[PDB]
């Protein structure tokens, strides 16, 4: 889950604070919504749940260019990881993300180890260009804040938050 200040990427360059989606959402609530949001690719998909998870310890992931998102320790963001030497997309939890890591950013809102790597469908998802791989600068505590998340109909179970790629959730 992520803090209320987080901007969800809506189609046509639009966006909205995740706390503004169901204004006055009760803490620890399940909320049915009907909202088009951008997926990991800039394609519109359906969000049909707005979750208010209540007060949780949160942490701010900040990149070296100053992109940032604040969320819980168990919040999954899409990162670019070296598995064998093959660069690949894995979900790291915020509590396991550390400096030098590379966050995947959806450029629609604004490739390390790949050239040393060279299997074209590989460097086509990556060099898709609708992406951007930002080096993490820090992950610092941010006290206890109200957090939110969405349920999406997308097939990758993802949606955009502050340019970051966040993972679908089924409950608050």
């Amino acid at each position: 889950a992520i803090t209320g200040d987080a901007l969800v990427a809506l189609p046509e360059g639009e966006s909205v604070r995740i706390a503004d989606i169901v204004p006055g959402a009760r803490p620890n609530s399940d909320n049915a919504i009907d909202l088009k949001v951008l997926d990991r690719h800039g394609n519109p998909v359906l969000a049909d749940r707005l979750f208010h998870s209540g007060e949780h310890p949160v942490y701010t992931v900040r990149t070296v260019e100053g992109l940032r998102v604040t969320g819980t320790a168990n919040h999954p963001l899409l990162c670019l990881v070296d598995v064998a030497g093959v660069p690949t997309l894995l979900w790291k939890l915020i509590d396991e993300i550390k400096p030098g890591d590379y966050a995947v950013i959806q450029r629609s809102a604004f490739v390390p180890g790949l050239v040393r790597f060279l299997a074209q469908a590989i460097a086509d998802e990556l060099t898709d260009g609708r992406f951007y791989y930002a080096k993490v600068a820090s992950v610092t505590d941010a006290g206890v804040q109200p957090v939110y998340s969405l349920r999406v109909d997308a097939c990758d179970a993802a949606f955009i938050t502050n340019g970051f790629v966040s993972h679908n959730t089924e409950a608050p």
């Binding site: 889950a1 998870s53 168990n74 919040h75 999954p76 979900w91 939890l93 998340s149 179970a157 993972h167 679908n168 959730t169 089924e170 409950a171 608050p172």
Partner: peptide, 4 residues
């Protein structure tokens, strides 16, 4: 994480 996925469940939430």
């Amino acid at each position: 994480a996925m469940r939430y």
